[PDB]
């Protein structure tokens, strides 16, 4: 099957390397998962070397995304795939891979922001005596806040969907975000 | 090739297993265990080839199944169990508590220790780090692992470890001026005092040792085993404890001829 040997490759001198043994199991490869962004989730268990298990996600619709600045992780549904660094047809086909820019709805993050900072964007005495303390340092990026009204936040996938069976990631902020914005604006 | 090997050819056996070359095609492969299978003496090579208690690979089993062997304070039945260094082979009934010590020629000797000295042993100490939930553990050099060690204990130390109630009684740090027995290489079985340790950033910590009789020899950071604090070992050495080069062995043979017999 698919193999990871240098057996079929060529020497650094550009000379053909002959074959002295067959293919071996401990050096095999497998077909790519080619994860898709779809509403009908499906993840299939794979049995790997040693008897352990890999989770090959064929279709996903939700994910676990983290806002690093406020350090809050929420489960939210991905809406679209907008950018792919490697192949430009992986966004047309809407394939979930690592480092692929996606859009996730901001409803859980809006709810957390409202219930934590006491401010809506997009009770007796303790709560009010503690809310203004969090409101003192409350500051948000304009580019970050302009997406709450739109309902979808740009984010980046940091997990490997075809290996862990999941699509987790982090919300784009700071120097990252505009770098992709200047690549997504037209 | 496709997996593990369950056979050990006689010619491939370790040298300290002095086995007759024309005794068979196979040697007893040491089982998985506390010791490295090349610095170990399997039980088959104890009741046989060292004691005349058993005569074949049929009476070693006939006396292990009676649960007559108690290595390191525990009955063991696997005839190829790797007793590897300073293990207390405590034969009950007859009372043959033996410490596995290293002969000056790299051999293995069953030093007959007294029973009350057989309730403990010593272990060399591998790295010491933090376990799960932040619980430090010991991880000695004979597979043993002890949780909650005293913070003074560090790597390469030695610990005096009890058997019936397995807890560290005391320990010796690794430093110059301590008795050390070498357990690897050509200098195996030679006791001495560490003079200085030389450190090379990257590998190969070399230890220089001074023999009691004036000789000096070097070895690796491994293969050494601290025995006692200062210059007094905590265990009884088998005999000699010195390298005893070939010429003085010839002298011993000569004087043995000229005395005792003397005729």
């Amino acid at each position: 099957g698919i193999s990871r040997d240098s057996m079929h490759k060529r020497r650094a001198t550009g000379g053909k390397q002959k074959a002295w043994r067959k293919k071996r199991k401990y050096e095999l490869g497998r077909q790519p998962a080619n994860t898709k962004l779809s509403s009908n989730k499906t993840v299939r268990r794979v049995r790997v070397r040693g008897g352990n298990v890999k989770w090959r996600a064929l279709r996903l619709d939700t994910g676990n995304f983290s806002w690093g600045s406020e350090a809050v992780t929420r489960k939210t549904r991905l809406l679209d795939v907008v950018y792919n660094s490697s192949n430009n047809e992986l966004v047309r086909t809407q394939t979930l891979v690592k480092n692929a820019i996606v859009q996730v709805d901001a409803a859980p993050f809006k709810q957390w922001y409202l219930t934590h900072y006491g401010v809506e964007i997009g009770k007796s005495n303790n709560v009010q005596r503690k809310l203004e303390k969090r409101q003192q340092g409350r500051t948000l990026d304009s580019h970050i806040e302009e997406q709450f009204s739109g309902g979808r936040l740009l984010a980046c996938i940091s997990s490997r969907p075809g290996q862990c069976g999941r699509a987790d990631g982090y919300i784009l902020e700071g120097k990252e975000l505009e770098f992709y914005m200047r690549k997504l604006q037209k | 090739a496709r997996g593990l090997k369950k056979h050990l050819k006689r010619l491939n056996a370790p040298s300290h297993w002095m086995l007759d070359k024309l005794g068979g095609a196979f040697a007893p492969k040491p089982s998985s265990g506390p010791h490295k299978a090349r610095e170990c003496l399997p039980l088959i090579l104890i009741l046989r080839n060292r004691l005349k208690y058993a005569l074949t690979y049929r009476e070693v089993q006939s006396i292990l199944m009676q649960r007559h062997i108690m290595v390191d304070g525990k009955v063991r039945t696997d005839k190829t169990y790797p007793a590897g260094f300073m293990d207390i082979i405590s034969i009950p009934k007859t009372g043959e508590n033996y410490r596995l010590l290293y002969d000056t020629k790299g051999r293995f000797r069953l030093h007959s220790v007294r029973d009350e000295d057989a309730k403990f042993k010593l272990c060399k100490v591998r790295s010491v780090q933090f376990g799960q939930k932040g619980i430090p553990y010991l991880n000695t050099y004979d597979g043993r692992t002890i949780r909650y060690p005293d913070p003074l204990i560090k790597a390469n130390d030695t610990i005096k470890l009890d058997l019936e109630t397995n807890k560290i009684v005391d320990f010796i740090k690794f430093d110059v001026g301590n008795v050390v027995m070498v357990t690897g290489g050509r200098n195996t079985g030679r006791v001495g005092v560490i003079k200085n340790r030389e450190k090379h950033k990257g590998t190969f910590e070399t230890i220089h040792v001074e023999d009691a009789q004036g000789h000096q020899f070097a070895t690796r950071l491994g293969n050494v085993f601290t025995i006692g604090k200062g210059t007094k070992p905590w265990v009884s050495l088998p005999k000699g404890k010195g390298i005893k080069l070939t010429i003085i062995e010839e002298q011993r043979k000569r004087d043995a001829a000229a005395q005792a017999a003397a005729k």
Partner: protein, 229 residues
């Protein structure tokens, strides 16, 4: 085309061989698990319905459910499935065998029918022969499910089905009964309590060791009164 008629309720099996084409045409396009009316295939089968759940070819090849119109095909069968047995084969080993589709046709040498409806007209054979079996279930809960019993009234004094009367060749009368396989005895409760006690011992030892190590670090802090005193 021979037929193996089986009475699953309380009867036995028999072989019925018929050759006329009119009677053996009704079952010439049915499949496995399809019902066939007894009258259509002949008389003496008025209130009777047979079910098709097997059949072998003219070469002994079996009929495999789920394959289309009768024609010998080759399938990469797994061990233990119908139409492929093991009996001396490696655990994960498959094999290509030859089967035929579930569709019934003239290419069959035998067909297995099971009686679904009792009917009203008797048949010499599988209608009167009453036979026993091995013991009723030997599980604990499957005794109280056979003799209607409550939570109490242990099943130990309930094996009335001693398979006696196997009189020995030496003229000795000995009785044989099975052993209940889920009965609760004091031994099981003792084992449960032993497991609980072991968990208690572990939970005590962990906290004891933690407390002693905390005390040792307190002593080390007392030793730290010498870095600058």
């Amino acid at each position: 085309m021979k037929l193996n008629i089986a009475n699953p309720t309380t009867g036995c099996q028999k072989k019925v061989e018929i050759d006329d084409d009119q009677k053996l045409r009704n079952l010439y396009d049915k499949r496995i698990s399809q019902e066939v009316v007894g009258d259509l295939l002949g008389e003496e089968f008025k209130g009777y319905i047979f079910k098709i759940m097997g059949g072998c070819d003219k070469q002994g090849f079996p009929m495999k459910q789920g394959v289309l119109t009768s024609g010998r095909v080759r399938l990469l069968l797994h061990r233990g499935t119908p139409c492929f047995r093991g009996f001396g084969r490696r655990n994960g080993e498959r094999r290509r065998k030859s089967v035929r589709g579930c569709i019934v046709s003239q290419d069959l040498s035998v067909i297995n029918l099971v009686i679904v409806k009792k009917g009203e007209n008797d048949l010499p054979g599988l209608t009167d022969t009453e036979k026993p079996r091995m013991r009723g279930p030997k599980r604990a809960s499957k005794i109280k499910k056979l003799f209607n019993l409550g939570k109490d009234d242990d099943v130990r004094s309930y094996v009335n089905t001693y398979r006696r009367t196997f009189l020995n060749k030496k003229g000795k009368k000995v009785s044989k009964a099975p052993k209940i396989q889920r009965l609760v005895t004091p031994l099981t409760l003792q084992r449960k309590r032993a497991r609980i006690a072991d968990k208690k011992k572990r939970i005590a030892k962990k906290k004891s060791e933690a407390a002693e190590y905390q005390k040792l670090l307190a002593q080390r802090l007392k030793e730290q009164r010498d870095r600058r005193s």
